[PDB]
């Protein structure tokens, strides 16, 4: 026999058998062949044969395992795999602060999270004083892993139950193993259509390969640790996820467990910086910062305290980075602004709906806050002035035609460039006329009016009359995976999330920024009253309209490229009206539906209260909300609030013609259009424009000036979610520096 190892380049000058399974085990002596698992782990040819040979006592145990490993995995069941999976002793790190030595557990002991959580040396003299096995240090040599035969496979991963559709060994888990918020679906399932904020369990994302190139050859270990980390975060999103919390949940045999534990911290901090975990409204204070002291030295001025500014500020603050927020208005929130004065209900003057809760940051934050959302039902009757609910067949007939018009638009645009763009509204019109011409079919006036409702609904979505919006690019964002699942009413209002994000941050109100100078060593920021601020980096999150107006003086000036992109998007607008009543007059006719539609008498009036929203899902209080979109936004600019209210009440008395309607006892009418520091509702792509505009606006300048806000998120434009995510995005970029 020999004392040398098979593996070329192995530094084991004295192989010893860890298995001792054969009554003939060679121990520290001679054997025909030493089989290598790592630089510190070997088993002799006798113990090899003990399982591998049919006439040996350990053959049963190896064939049974070989069967489970077949009905469960995609990797070949080799004896070395069996060894690493079944016989290799566990290692656990002493938890005594001043010791922290790694210890080998005896071969019969099965390591559990509870054992790892509290382990100290000797747990069955000063056991902590016994020297650490010399093999432990070796593990932190980069070549150590390179001479590992097989990659680690985790046991009982917290991620396991979420991945039952994959081969465990394809996602870093062991084939021989084995009440979450329904909105948490972090992992793509096999054969799934795209959905927002999903990761593949079996493939590294581009940014991941960028940060951890050493895993491009074999991503097994990374995926297992990343998947575990996400599972743990979503299992409990109310606490910071730390390495200490993860380590006990890393269960794998062998010295490799030490390498796994050493990697988890790197991956944790990357996940945190990028905003995948330890995020949302989670708050962390002095001596709880989520990123190492290495990121802390730096400073930032954030301009704007809406969802985007507050997202970035929350992230950076939690990171340990010095942040100051400058807000123009006497309040935070921006286009989030809730009226809490209504009886028993919260009514948003701005945002209040969550579009697609699955994996939505907003859904996470509701979880963290213990907030419940109301899922909208599907029903939305199209009610005519005055009284008549639209015939179901007429309804279906015109829905079909409306969407058929969209199909042909999407067909027309395929070969058109930005230089040939035409307005969506004009395109739809032409296609419609040319269809009635082609086919002698003729629609009634009502059928035409129902079509107008649908058109109005497009205008609400874009915040613009359709003759302004791009036929080519109106729905550009759907090129990317969107947020799936329920659309909900955020009944408590977005303001609760806003408050929570801002709580304890350094925020200066009534401080409108007028000048940003990034020509010197650090950014000089000056307010409209001449007050000076300075920091290493600046993030601007002001609304698109304000960038278009040029209310902030940039030195040096924004690029011509940026200006073209800024002007290629539209500062979309809608206004809201809310009305309180003495009683729920609509219950008889509406029958519990979350909303009801209003068939337009004419094309010109189509955006005047097209949809009415019942603002109490408990059906107890009497508040209606409606919207003003498209052409009707203009028609209302010279009308005072009372006049708008009069037209809304006139509309309601038409919609409910065959009954009486009580007077409203309290109401509001929004004027976002003329709020000086906002001047809009949400962005859209103007004719001639491209989705790429969102990317261009998003582009930092010289890693010194950064941009966020709904109009900088190409994937998720318009929304609080999108604005929030753009802030997380920029916080990651800024923290990397």
């Amino acid at each position: 026999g020999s004392r040398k190892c098979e593996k070329a380049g192995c530094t084991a000058t004295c192989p010893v058998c860890f298995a001792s399974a054969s009554e003939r085990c060679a121990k520290n002596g001679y054997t025909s062949r030493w089989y290598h698992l790592s630089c510190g782990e070997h088993f002799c040819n006798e113990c090899f044969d003990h399982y591998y040979r049919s006439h040996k006592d350990g053959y049963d145990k190896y064939t049974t395992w070989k069967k489970i490993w077949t009905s469960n995995g995609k990797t070949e069941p080799s004896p070395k795999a069996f060894m690493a999976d079944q016989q290799l002793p566990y290692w656990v790190q002493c938890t005594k602060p001043e010791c922290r030595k790694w210890r080998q557990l005896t071969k019969e002991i099965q390591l559990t999270p509870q054992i790892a959580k509290t382990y100290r040396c000797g747990m069955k003299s000063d056991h902590c004083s016994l020297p650490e096995d010399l093999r432990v240090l070796e593990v932190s040599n980069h070549w150590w892993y390179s001479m590992l035969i097989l990659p680690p496979l985790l046991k009982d991963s917290v991620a396991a139950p979420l991945l039952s559709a994959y081969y465990p060994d394809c996602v870093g888990m062991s084939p021989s193993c084995t009440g979450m918020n329904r909105y948490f679906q972090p992992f793509y399932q096999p054969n799934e259509c795209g959905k927002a904020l999903c990761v593949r369990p079996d493939v590294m994302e581009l940014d991941e390969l960028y940060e951890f190139p050493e895993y491009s050859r074999d991503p097994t270990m990374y995926l297992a640790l990343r998947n575990l980390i996400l599972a743990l975060w979503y299992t409990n999103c109310k606490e910071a996820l730390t390495p200490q919390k993860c380590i006990p949940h890393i269960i794998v045999r062998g010295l490799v467990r030490i390498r796994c534990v050493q990697e988890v911290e790197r991956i944790l901090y990357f996940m945190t910086r990028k905003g995948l975990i330890n995020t949302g409204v989670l708050s962390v204070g002095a001596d709880q910062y989520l990123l190492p002291k290495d990121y802390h030295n730096k400073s930032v001025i954030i301009i704007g305290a809406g969802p985007a500014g507050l997202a970035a500020a929350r992230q950076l603050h939690n990171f340990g980075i010095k942040v100051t927020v400058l807000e123009a208005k006497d309040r935070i929130g921006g286009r989030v602004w809730d009226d809490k004065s209504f009886k028993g209900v919260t009514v948003g003057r701005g945002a209040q709906i969550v579009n697609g809760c699955i994996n939505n940051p907003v859904a996470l934050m509701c979880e963290q806050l213990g907030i419940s959302m109301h899922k909208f039902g599907e029903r939305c009757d199209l009610i005519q002035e005055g009284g008549r609910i639209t015939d179901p067949t007429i309804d279906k007939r015109m829905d079909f035609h409306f969407n058929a018009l969209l199909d042909v638009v999407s067909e027309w645009r395929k070969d058109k460039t930005q230089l040939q763009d035409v307005p969506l509204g004009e395109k739809i019109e032409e296609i419609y006329k040319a269809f009635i011409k082609e086919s002698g079919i003729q629609f009634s006036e009502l059928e035409g009016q129902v079509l107008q409702f649908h058109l109005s609904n497009l205008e609400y979505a874009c915040g613009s009359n359709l003759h302004q919006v791009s036929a080519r690019s109106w729905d550009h964002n759907e090129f990317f995976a969107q947020f799936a699942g329920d659309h909900t009413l955020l009944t408590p209002g977005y303001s609760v999330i806003i408050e929570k994000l801002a709580e304890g941050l350094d925020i200066q109100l009534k401080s409108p920024v007028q000048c940003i100078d990034y020509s010197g060593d650090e950014v000089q920021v000056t307010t409209t009253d001449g007050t000076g601020y300075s920091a290493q980096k600046v993030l601007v999150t002001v609304p698109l309209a304000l960038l278009q107006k040029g209310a902030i003086q940039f030195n040096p000036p924004l690029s011509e490229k940026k200006m073209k992109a800024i002007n290629s998007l539209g500062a979309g607008i809608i206004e809201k009206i809310a009305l309180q009543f003495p009683y729920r007059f609509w219950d008889s006719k509406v029958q519990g539906a979350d909303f009801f539609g209003h068939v337009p008498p004419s094309a010109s009036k189509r955006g005047l209260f097209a949809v009415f929203y019942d603002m109490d899902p408990q059906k107890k209080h009497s508040v209606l909300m409606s919207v003003i979109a498209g052409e009707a936004v203009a028609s209302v600019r010279t009308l005072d609030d009372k006049q708008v209210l009069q037209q809304c009440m006139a509309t309601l008395r038409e919609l409910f013609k065959e009954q009486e309607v009580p007077d409203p006892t309290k109401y509001f009418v929004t004027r976002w259009s003329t709020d000086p520091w906002i001047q809009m509702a949400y962005s859209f792509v103007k004719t001639g424009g491209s989705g790429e505009a969102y990317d261009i606006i998003a582009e930092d300048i010289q890693g010194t000036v950064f941009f966020a806000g709904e109009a900088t998120n190409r994937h998720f434009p318009q929304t609080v979610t999108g604005a929030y995510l753009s802030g997380v995005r920029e916080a990651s970029k800024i923290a990397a520096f």
Partner: peptide
């Protein structure tokens, strides 16, 4: 954008649906 719609969502004009076909799948 279409994604802003809750009540009475439009459906026409959508690009074909893509479906992840990974090998890691049992």
């Amino acid at each position: 954008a279409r994604t802003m719609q809750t009540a009475r969502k439009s459906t026409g004009g959508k690009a074909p649906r893509k479906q992840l076909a990974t090998k890691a799948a049992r």
